Each structure stands twice: as C-alpha cells, then as structure tokens.
Motif scaffolding. Structure first.
Motif, short mmCIF file in Angstrom:
data_model
loop_
_atom_site.label_atom_id
_atom_site.label_comp_id
_atom_site.label_asym_id
_atom_site.label_seq_id
_atom_site.Cartn_x
_atom_site.Cartn_y
_atom_site.Cartn_z
N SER B 341 -1.25 -3.00 -0.29
CA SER B 341 -2.30 -3.13 -1.30
C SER B 341 -3.71 -2.98 -0.72
N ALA B 342 -4.69 -2.63 -1.55
CA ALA B 342 -6.07 -2.38 -1.16
C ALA B 342 -6.76 -3.56 -0.47
N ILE B 345 -5.15 -3.72 3.30
CA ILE B 345 -5.69 -2.71 4.21
C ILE B 345 -6.82 -3.32 5.03
N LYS B 346 -7.93 -3.70 4.39
CA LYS B 346 -9.09 -4.23 5.13
C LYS B 346 -8.90 -5.64 5.66
N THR B 399 -11.37 2.08 5.67
CA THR B 399 -10.57 3.08 4.93
C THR B 399 -11.15 3.31 3.53
N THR B 401 -10.93 3.28 0.17
CA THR B 401 -10.12 2.82 -0.97
C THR B 401 -10.78 3.20 -2.30
N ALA B 404 -9.77 1.65 -5.95
CA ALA B 404 -10.08 0.22 -5.94
C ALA B 404 -11.58 -0.10 -6.13
N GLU C 343 -2.12 2.98 -2.23
CA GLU C 343 -2.84 2.10 -1.31
C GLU C 343 -2.16 2.09 0.07
N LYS C 346 -2.79 5.57 1.90
CA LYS C 346 -4.14 5.76 2.44
C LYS C 346 -4.33 5.03 3.76
N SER C 350 -4.12 6.79 8.05
CA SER C 350 -5.55 6.60 8.38
C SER C 350 -5.98 7.12 9.74
#
Lengths: 394, 450, 450, 49
Positions: B341-342, B345-346, B399, B401, B404, C343, C346, C350
C-alpha cells in the motif's frame, strides 16, 4: 618474480615505510635542475631530416681605374654545412601492482627524474662534451681561450678576458657563471677594501648575482655549470644554435620483452610473464656551435692549457706553431719531442723551459703551455688533414 | 612573492600525492581485487576465482539516483511572489544557465563523484569562442571536475579556497597534458603539452576570490573536507561477504560431493593399471560391484560439506549490509515483503528519504555559491543582496505515488471552495518550478475559451 | 598539418587494438564459452557440456527495452507560448528527421550497444544522389554505429573528437571492404578492391567539427569513456553461477544414484563370465537374489549426493544477482510472490525505474548534440541559441497502470471545475508529445457537436 | 622509417606482399612448387599431355 632486482621496482627496501603516517613530502629535497643551454642559445626549427645551413664566403671585389682602362671581372662564392639530430633515451620498470599502488608517487616522480637526467645530459654534451653523440658539432670547453678571475672579477672579465676576445676579432655578448663564483665577486675589492659589485651598507645581493648585467652584457647564473676547473664562460652566445625534433614522448607497456643484459650476451625477461610494466622515454635534440673559439673559459685561479697536435698523413714541408699570436720558427713533421719544446720556448716572450711541457712521439705531439696556442699547417707541401684541439686543463 | 610557473609544479605534486588516497574508495565502487576480500579456505591455485560484491555500488547509486534540482527561489522585493517563471525574472536567469550548460546531465554525474571520493569541484569561466564550440558564447561556462583531475587548497581559517589546479592526462601513458591554475584574481593555463612541452596563457577575472567551488559530503562540522560515502562499516561487511562467497564457491567445487573410500581390498586385487594408478569402471546406472574378500574389506564415505551452513552467514551479512546502508529491506532481497500500500512504501523508504534530503541541503550550499559567483562573473558590479538568500528547490526524493496524491489534492481544493489556493495543489502534486509556469499558460487558455 | 593516408592507417591500427578489449565483454552478453565458467568437479571428458547463464543478457535487455523518445522540446525566445502548435515548430522539425531516418528502430539497438560496450556512435551525413536509394533527399542522413565498426579519438582536453574511422568488414572474417575517415571539415572513403585501396572518393562538410557523436555509458564523472554495464560484480556472479550449474548437472550424470557393492563374494561363485567381467541381472520387480556367505560376505552401498545441496546455493546466488542489478525480484524468479496492486508495483520496480531515468538523461545529451550538428548540416549558419537549451522528452519507463492513472486524473480535472488545465491531465496520463496533437485536433472537432 | 614512410614504402610493401601471397597460391595449385601437405593435388600431376 625476480624480486628486489637492481633493474626493476618490486616492493624493494624503499617501500618499507608506506601507507601509514609518513611525514608528507620531506622538507629537505632540492628543486629539479633546470637546463641551461636551452635558455641562452636560440632555438632553431629542426626536422627529423636535419637542416642545411647556407653561408656566403666569396671575396668579391672592385678596383680603382683610370679613364679608358678596361674594367675587371669578379666571381662571388657560397658554401653549406649540414646539422643532424641525435636521440637520447631510457627505460624504467616496475611490478604491475607497484604501478597500481604508486607508493611515494614513484611512477609519477620517476617521469620528473628522467626528464631532469635527459635535460642534464644535453647540457653536459654542450658544455663539457662528456658523452656527446657524434652528430653534435662542437662543445664550449673545446675553446682555445682561458682567463683567471681570482683576485677580482672586474680586471678578469672587463679588461683581460675581453682583450682575449677582441684581439681575435670576436665580440662579448653574454656571460654564464656557476654559483661557486659568488665568493670571488663578493671578494672583488678596490684598494680600500670596498666591494666593486655591491653598494654601501651592503644589504643588496651582489649585482650579477641578481642576473644584472656586467659592463652592458647580461649575466646568466647556474647551480651546475662548473666542471673540472672551469667555473663559467664569456663569449658570443649568438654563435650557438640548438633544436628538438619532438617532446619527451613517454610510452608504456605491460606486454613487451626486455633484455636486462647486453646485445653481446642477452638476458631476456617477458614483461607479460613476470607481470611487470615498463616505461619508454626518448627525446631527439640537435646542436651546432658555429665557432668554439668565440668563448673564453673562466677559471677560479690561474691554469695551464694542454693541446693535442695531429699531423696524420703529413709527408712533406713544415708547420708553424703560434703562442698568443707570436709565431715560432717553422718545424718539420718528423721533428723530435724535445725539438718542439725548444721551438715553442724560442718564441720571444714570457715562456720558459721549466714551465712549458711537451710529450708524445713525432707527428702526434701533446703541448702543455701557459696560453692560447694556434697552428698554421699551410707549409705542409703534402699530407693535408692535419689538426689541433684542446684536450684538458694542463 | 611566488612565481606561478613554480606554484604550478608544487600544486601538481600535491595533486599527484592526493591520488594515492582516492584509490581506496575506487576499489570498492568498481569492485577491484582487494587483499582483505580473498577467502582464506580456498586453496592457493583456486585464488584466481575472485567473488566480487555489489553493496557499495548499490548504496552510492541509490542516493545519487534520487537527487534532482527543479530551480531556485530568490526572495522578492516588498512581496511580489505571484509573478511568472518567465518575463526575465531574477530566479529564472540562473535556471537558464543551468539548462544551457546541460547541468541537468552533468550534475548527477558530479554528485556521484562527490559521494565516491567525498568531494567534487564546480568551476566557472566566460567561454572563449576563439575555439569552435557548441555553446552560447554569452552564457557563463559553469562546469564540473572530479577530484581525480582537480585539486584545491582550502584555508582552514576562512574555509575559502586559496588556489586550485586542474590537470588532465593525455592517454594510457598517464602523462599530464594540460595544467590550468586558478588564482584569486586570474586564471592561468599552460594551455597544452601536446607533445613537446607547454607555453603559458592568462585571463584575469572580475572576482576577488577563486572561481572554483568544492561540493563536498561533509557529514558534521568536524569535517573540514568531505568523507567518502562508502562508510568503514559498509566496507567491512562488503569484504566479509566477499570472503563468505569465495569460501562457499570453492567448497561447492571441492566438497559438495561425498567422497567414496574402500578399505582392505588391495590395488593388485582390484587390478589397477600400475603406470597410472586406476581402472575405468563402466559406471552406468544399473550395475552392482562385487569386490571379493578384500582380506576383510569395507566401504565408507567422507560426508559432503552442506552449503546451507554458508547461506545462513550470507543472509546475516545481507541483514547487516541493509542495516548499515539504510536502504529498503528488499533492495538487498533481505525480505520478500513488498509494501502492499501507498503508506507502506514510504514507511520502508523513510531512512533513505531522510538521508537524500540531508544530501540535498548539503549540496544545495555549493550550488548557491556556483550561481552567486556566476552572476558577478557575467554581470560585473556587485551581487543584489536578495541573491545572498537564494535557496535551491529539489524534487521530492520519495517514490512517486501519483494516484494517492490525486485524492488529497482534489479534496483539499474542492473546486473553488476548499482550504488551499490552486497553486498550492500543484506544489503538493510535485509539478516542477518549470512545469508550473507551463501550467499557467494552459490554464489561461482554458479560461479564455470558457 | 596532418596527412590523411598515414592518419587512416594510424587510426585503423588503434581500432584493431580496441577490438581486443570489446570481445571480453561480448563474451558475457552473447554467452560464448568463458574459461572461468567450467565446473571444476566435472571430469575432463564431460567438460564439453558447457552451462550458459543468462544474467548479463537479462539485465541489459531489461534496461534497453524500456527506453523510448517521445520528441524534443525547445524553449521559445521570451516564453511567449507553451507549445507553438503543429505549424512546423522548432521541435516538430527535429522530430520529422527522427521518423524520416527510422531512428526509433535504430536508437533502441544503439542503446543496447552503449550498454554492452560502454559506447556507440551517432553519425551525420547528407544522402548521396548516387547511393542510398530509399531516403527523403532533403533530410540529413543520421545513422548509428557500434564500437565494433566505428572508432574516434576523443580529445580529453576538450571532450570533442579529433578524428574518427568507420571500417566496414566483408561478409566473412578479416577482410576490410572499405574504410571511411571523418575530419573536422572533410570525409574520405577508400574501397579495398583486389587487396588494394582505390583512390579516396571525398566530400567536404559544412561543420567545423567532426560529424560523429559518442553515446557513452558514463557511470560517474571521472569514468571518462563509459564502462560496460555488465559490471565486475555482475560478471562475477554470472561466472560463479555457471560453475555451480555445471557441477550440479554433472552430479546428476554420475553421482545422484546410490552405488551398490557386495563384499566376500568370489567372482567365480557369482558366475562372472571371466573374459568380459559381467553377468546379466534380470531386474523385474521383486526377484530375490541369493548367495553363499563365505569371507563374511555382505551387501552395502554408497549414498547418492543430494542435488539439493547445490540448488540451495543457486537460490543464494539468484538473490545476489537481483541485489547487484536492481531488477524486480521476479525477473530472476527468486520466488513466486509478485506485487498484487498498483501501489506494490510502483515500489517493486523502484530501482529499475530510476536506473532507466538516469540512463535517459545520459543518452539525451548525445541526441541533443547529434541534432545540433544535423541542424547546421542541412540548414547552415549559426544555430539559433534556443537550441543550446533544448531537451529530450523520454517516455515514463514505469509499468503503465492505466486504470489508476485514469481514476486519479479524472478527479483532478472534474469536468473543468478542478485543479488542472485539460492538457496537463494528458501528460499526467502519459499521452505523448506526438499523440496529444491529434487530441487537440479531435477536441477542436468534438466542440462542434458538444 | 615508419615515422617518415619515404616513397610510401610501408603502403607499397603491403601491395607487393599481397601479390606474393597470390603467386604462392597459384604456383602451389598449378605446378605444386612449394605446396603444403594439406593441398589435395596440383594440375601438373595429370598423366595426359
């Protein structure tokens, strides 16, 4: 490989201190010696072919005539002289991992050190002739003139030395001096004891030692001009020309083969199989001095001069020796060693039987004398190709 | 005083001396042969089969790969900030000299050497169109040089450069072939040594200080000069993982097969060839071997080495290399757990992103001075004091996104009615300084069309 | 100064010397036999069964297949218009030559060589009346050539090329059929008929610079010629995995089967046919064998090797081959799991996405220089100084999740009441510079109906 | 000699050598003059005149 060899660099003893808190470059190494002749002789364009210098020579002339006298006929003349380059070279060798490491920057430092050695070899070949290639024509020490400078330089250079040039009809345009001359310029004094070449209260460095001119002529200084018993020169430095066909031309291999021995007895090593890198260096200088007699050698105190006299092929007639321009009576090509000694001391001035020396067999004489010596061979009726040269200080 | 033609050889000497340091980090990024990497259990003749390892390249690439510059902010006089990215605006001219020098291309290379060697250098001149080039002869020739080619001596009191030398090497002979010296009020160059040896050339410059700026990876004030980004921790787990790969590789050749022994049964009783010590047994699949009494013989085996005993150590060193780098855990394959999920990621990128954002600040200071010098170099006179406050705008290094962000930027704007003005919706979307100017021109057209 | 006939042979010799470096990297991409690939456990009669490992080819293909140029961009003289339309604007001019040379085919091949060898060369010429049928006679002929056929003396003091030579080899092996030499103002071609060079047919050109431009794979600023992309780490894990595969394969031929022994049994009592050394075991199902028990006779067996003891090390080398290349894990097939959502995609790609964005910026500088030369070559005079500021618009190299992009952009535009002007929503959707023009035409028509 | 290449000696040499390569083929295939053992015959071996 062939570890610690005299001929290659392999983690020999030198690199025992490496890659640790070693004290930078050191504080004591002197700067690399510059060339000297390359800053006083004019550089002349030189091709790999060499060059031809033309020269006029013909004694063309005219005559006074009365009215109705039929007018005379004349012819000019010309001649030519060739000059060729000569190569100087070296190779140095190190283990390939020594080249990767480059300890104490050695593979960089070496390129500066060989350049200095190659420059120095040119100056030695021009000044003293020490190893000069056969293509180089003349060297400064080959001059038939000398002067002392010991008590003071002013009388030595500006009066006596200049007299020995202008009496030969040759001029003085530059002077070239070694650092070891500084005490005899600092010690050059008037009768009261004041120095000649520096002004009152004596803060300033002595005039020619700032590259100042002496009696109009520029002074050129050096740290390495001196050799034997000669400390410098005075003369017409326009009489020297030099050239360089191309640059120092570094080249490199990991793959060739070298003979570590000699042509007469080889000792081949492959650079590839023993894993060594080798660098190849060459330069292609050339030189001509138009007339080596145009220069006075400078000497730190008085000296004798010695000459080789060559009568190869002489077969008829007589030759004439001359000391400072005063001619001897004529001498036979077959004359004894003691005959030549008795003849030179029979010149009307200053000579003596206890100071003058003569050595060697008939026709191959060596003469040692307190002066400039010159010869006329034109009284030889057959066997031209006779000659005279300086060979050392006496 | 000092003669510049003597200072030349002194700086060339100091520059060559510096090169012996840089070989240390080059060997980690190019993965050259290193003594401490060699696996000791491998027998001496197999030592040629070197296993190389890619953590240092992977890490130094993953930082420099994220950095991009969008433009500069120069603060306005008395509140004038709504104005365009065009119209000869102060902040736009300093971006034209970035595009014209293609520093878009060259700075991502220069920032990589700044990480590898801990420093690179930016240099400035007006161009000399007296030599034919593909540059606009008006634009100041801002250019980047690596520490393998340029060296500059810092004054430790001011942290200014005192003077600097650029050298270039002609071919594989590794001779130096031009030497350019930068001095506080002039640039002087022994223009070439293209064979032969050099002759000088000189051009005085309008600045009162050396037109070279070090861009450097200085990590805390105690660094008067930047450290390499390839940290001693990461070097040690690189070289450790090289030994484990190399020992494992040799073990797979020599010990992965259980060795077979017979005892008692004599060589003459087997009928081995006495010249060569062997028989060619037929060895196809079905066969049974009958070996006679062998005077009371038996068969037995040495066990295979089992390679999973090494793989658990390779995995441990991969977790350490992930920990000391701060990359996402899947960049070293240390977990297959890809972020679903978005948000996730971070979550994983957070230690990489906060590192790249520090590098953007630390390099942004060099690009201030490179532009502040270039203004004076071109325009003469003095810096308009608004330029002493200029700051670089970098891209968001995370990244992208995209979808989102569209929910958020739509809901915050809510057509006219929401809490943000239109422009801020574009800034949060990450459309660049150059792009948001292009945007206003299209939006004007949609407004005029109606 | 220099003479063509000797310069031709001087370059041609350096070119032939360069071909001895290049093939060492080709042996990885083409997967030819490497001395280091051979599995040392395999006996000397089976080492003709080479095992070839596809990491190098996989890595270069995965980068090189994801690079596309949409078109150029060139800035307007005062920022007057965002795009100056389809009326032969400065950008669509350059794009016309791109299609007219089919550069969209030739470039993606050239990029594959730039990645294998570290460089490949663009070249520019006018088409002949006499030669090259099938090209538009007004356009400059721009074509790309590998370092296996064209070579250039790049000048390290200036980053231009002094001169360059193109050597055409004949259909079989060592025969050169022609050589073409490029000067700063001239070109010369020798054909090599009957073992001899003929006279150099020759043309001047309208530049004052050599009409050859290198693409180079410059990894970092001090990499002055561009390395191969098959880096020493990826070569090493390629050769390492080749050995493990070859040992594992050989083990299945010799050792993956238990070996069955009988002790005490006299060969005569077992009825071995003594002139052959065999007897025929009829193998069918459950036939119980029987023997006399003298000499303490018994049956025992050597164990098989576990082939899994190699496979569980191959699975370790695949995790390294991913880690050093940055490919998405499932490109090595490291594991079954793969990203379930847009998601997760991506994030998973990366590294490879930002690697390709970095390559696009580096190759863009070559196509900029090739177009600036091509402009001088047809159009003459000094280039309009906007062309020094031009840019190449590469396509987004990420996997196109069209449904997520559609939902997001329709939310930003909100039927014209939202935070986006219409034709920004197009470049967010990824419709190309060339494609969007057709949407301007179709929309202009659609406005006549609703 | 290579730096100067007088009278294009090097270029001339390659053309003269290449000519000698060809003559060493024909005089090996027609009359056998220096034929290597790898050549399966030469025309003068015919029994017909």
């Amino acid at each position: 490989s062939a570890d610690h060899s005299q001929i290659a660099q392999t983690k020999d003893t030198m690199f025992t201190g490496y890659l640790d808190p070693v004290q930078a470059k050191d504080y004591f190494a002197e700067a690399e010696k510059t060339s000297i002749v390359q800053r006083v002789a004019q550089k002349i364009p030189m091709g790999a072919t060499g060059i031809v210098i033309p020269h006029w020579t013909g004694d063309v002339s005219a005559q006074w005539i009365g009215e109705g006298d039929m007018k005379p006929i004349t012819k000019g003349n010309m001649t030519k002289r060739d000059v060729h380059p000569a190569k100087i070279a070296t190779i140095f060798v190190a283990s390939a991992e020594t080249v990767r490491a480059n300890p104490a920057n050695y593979l960089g430092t070496m390129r500066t050190k060989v350049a200095t050695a190659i420059a120095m070899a040119f100056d030695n070949a021009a000044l003293h002739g020490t190893n000069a290639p056969s293509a180089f024509q003349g060297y400064l020490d080959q001059s038939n003139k000398t002067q002392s400078i010991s008590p003071n330089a002013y009388q030595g250079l500006g009066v006596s030395g200049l007299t020995k040039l202008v009496t030969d009809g040759k001029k003085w345009t530059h002077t070239l001096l070694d650092d070891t001359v500084e005490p005899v310029l600092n010690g050059s004094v008037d009768a009261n004891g004041r120095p000649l070449f520096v002004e009152s209260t004596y803060e300033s460095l002595t005039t020619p030692f700032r590259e100042g001119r002496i009696l109009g002529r520029p002074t050129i200084l050096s740290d390495h001009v001196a050799e034997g018993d000669v400390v410098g020169y005075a003369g017409d430095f326009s009489q020297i020309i030099w050239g360089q066909v191309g640059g120092l031309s570094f080249d490199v291999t990991d793959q060739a083969t070298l003979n570590l021995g000699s042509q007469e007895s080889p000792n081949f090593v492959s650079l590839w199989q023993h894993n060594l890198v080798a660098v190849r260096v060459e330069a292609e200088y050339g030189l001509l001095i138009n007339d080596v007699n145009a220069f006075v050698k400078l000497t730190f105190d008085p000296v004798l001069t010695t000459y080789a006299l060559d009568l190869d092929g002489a077969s008829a007639g007589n030759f004439t020796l001359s000391l400072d321009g005063k001619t001897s009576a004529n001498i036979a090509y077959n004359a004894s060693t003691a005959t030549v000694k008795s003849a030179i001391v029979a010149i009307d001035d200053g000579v003596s039987a206890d100071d003058v020396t003569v050595t060697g067999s008939a026709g191959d004489y060596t003469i040692t004398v307190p002066g400039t010596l010159t010869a006329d061979f034109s009284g030889l009726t057959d066997g031209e190709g006779a000659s005279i040269s300086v060979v050392s200080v006496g | 005083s000092i003669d510049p033609e003597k200072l030349r050889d002194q700086l060339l000497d100091a520059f060559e001396n510096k090169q012996n340091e840089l070989k240390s980090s080059k060997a980690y990024y190019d993965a050259e042969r290193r003594p401490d990497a060699i696996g000791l259990a491998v027998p001496l003749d197999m030592r040629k089969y070197l296993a190389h390892v890619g953590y240092p390249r992977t890490y130094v690439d993953a930082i420099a790969e994220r950095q991009e510059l969008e433009g500069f902010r120069i603060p306005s006089a008395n509140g004038e900030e709504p104005e365009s990215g065009g119209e000869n605006d102060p902040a736009s001219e300093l971006w034209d000299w970035w595009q014209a020098n293609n520093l878009d291309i060259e700075a991502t290379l220069g920032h990589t050497d700044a990480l590898i060697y801990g420093t690179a250098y930016i240099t400035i001149s007006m161009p000399d169109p007296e030599v034919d080039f593909d540059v606009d002869p008006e634009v100041p020739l801002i250019r980047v040089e690596p520490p393998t080619a340029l060296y500059a001596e810092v004054d430790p009191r001011t942290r200014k450069v005192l003077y600097a030398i650029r050298a270039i090497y002609g071919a594989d002979g590794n001779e130096i072939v031009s030497a350019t010296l930068y001095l506080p009020d002039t640039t002087m160059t022994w223009l070439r040594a293209e064979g032969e040896w050099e002759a000088p050339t000189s051009t005085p410059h309008g600045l009162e200080m050396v037109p070279v700026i070090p861009i450097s990876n200085r990590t805390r004030l105690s660094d008067l000069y930047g450290t390499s980004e390839i940290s001693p921790e990461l070097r040690s787990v690189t070289d450790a993982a090289a030994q484990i790969l190399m020992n494992m590789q040799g073990t797979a050749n020599l010990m992965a097969i259980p060795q077979r022994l017979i005892f008692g049964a004599k060589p003459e009783e087997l009928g081995i060839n006495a010249e060569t010590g062997q028989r060619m047994f037929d060895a196809y699949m079905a066969r049974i071997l009958a070996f006679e009494g062998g005077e009371g013989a038996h068969a037995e085996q040495f066990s295979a080495a089992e390679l999973r005993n090494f793989v658990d150590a390779l995995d441990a060193l991969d977790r350490k290399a992930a920990s000391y780098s701060g990359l996402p855990p899947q960049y070293l394959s240390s977990s297959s757990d890809n972020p679903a999920s978005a948000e996730a990621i971070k979550a994983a990128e957070s230690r990489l992103v906060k590192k790249v954002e520090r590098k953007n600040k630390i390099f942004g200071g060099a690009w201030e001075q490179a532009m502040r010098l270039a203004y004076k170099m071109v325009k003469g006179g003095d810096i308009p004091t608004e330029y002493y406050r200029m700051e670089t705008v970098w891209r968001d290094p995370s990244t992208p996104t995209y979808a989102a962000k569209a929910d958020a930027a739509a809901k915050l704007f809510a057509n006219g009615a929401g809490l943000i003005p239109r422009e801020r919706g574009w800034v949060d979307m990450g459309y660049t300084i150059v792009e948001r100017e292009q945007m206003r021109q299209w939006l004007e057209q949609d407004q005029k069309q109606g």
